[PDB]
Design a protein around this nucleic acid. Structure first.
Ligand code: AR6
Ligand code: NCA
Length: 209
DNA sequence: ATGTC
């Protein structure tokens, strides 16, 4: 019998540790089109250019770059490309944070969101607004440790949770890290912003390659 | 195993 979604339903945003000061200084993740003060890009430029022009067909509309992106799993295919040094970024996985929240927290906060059933740049991706439609996602695919094939599993592992324009730091519940050295550095950065929520910092080597 | 398509 096919797996269901946990409730609350965790959502994950990966970013380089060099960006955490900018996230705390703004008090939020900003969408790409909101010009976040990022220090370190870990993206593929050629797929960023697709996101730059990919329409979001549910309200509040706009394009994929108008939304702060999350996945429904850690240990993403994106993180594999970073781990293997396939990106322009050559620093590897160790300085990449997993920022964790939930779908339900976003809804309760009244923030506009959409989600997809597969990688959002695919022309056949379905888009949803109602958390009951989390039943449309493939939770086997989302949880799969081996995702390279078959193709439908590879697409559906990359179902995305999309928050319009900005995501408030106070909705982050956990920062997951690869190593003790990165966890310590995360805590030093948080202590420079004493008015900000300090989520638990957890070493989760099984969220990495 | 997996170099986001
Ligand atoms: N306030 C902030 N201060 C500093 N950095 C920030 C802030 N807010 C966000 N960032 C970072 O600013 C950046 C916003 O970029 P985006 O497009 O949304 O996410 P991606 O680049 O991770 O993944 C997209 C790629 O995945 C696949 C395709 O190749 C896509 O291009 C992120 O690093 C944020 O953490
Ligand atoms: N940076 C990310 O975690 C992310 C999540 C979903 C899609 N693209 C990027």
């Amino acid at each position: 019998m096919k797996r269901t979604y946990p409730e609350p339903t965790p959502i994950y945003h990966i970013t380089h540790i060099d960006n955490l000061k900018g996230i705390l200084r703004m008090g939020k993740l900003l969408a790409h089109n909101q010009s976040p003060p990022k220090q370190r890009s870990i993206a593929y430029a050629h797929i960023q250019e697709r996101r730059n022009r990919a329409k979001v067909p549910q309200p509040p509309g706009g394009v994929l770059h108008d939304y702060v992106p999350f996945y429904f799993c850690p240990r993403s295919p994106m993180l594999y490309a970073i781990y293997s040094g396939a990106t322009e970024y050559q620093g590897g996985q160790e300085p990449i944070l997993h920022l964790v929240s939930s779908a339900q927290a976003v809804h309760k906060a009244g923030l506009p969101f959409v989600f997809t059933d597969r990688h959002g740049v695919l022309s056949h991706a379905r888009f949803f607004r109602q958390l009951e439609e989390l039943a449309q996602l493939d939770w086997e695919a989302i949880q799969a440790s081996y995702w390279a094939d078959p193709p439908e599993l590879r697409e559906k592992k990359q179902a995305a949770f999309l928050v319009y324009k900005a995501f408030p730091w106070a909705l982050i519940e956990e920062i997951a890290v690869y190593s003790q050295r990165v966890g310590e550095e995360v805590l030093k950065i948080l202590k420079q912003f004493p008015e900000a929520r300090r989520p638990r910092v957890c070493i989760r080597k099984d969220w990495y390659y």
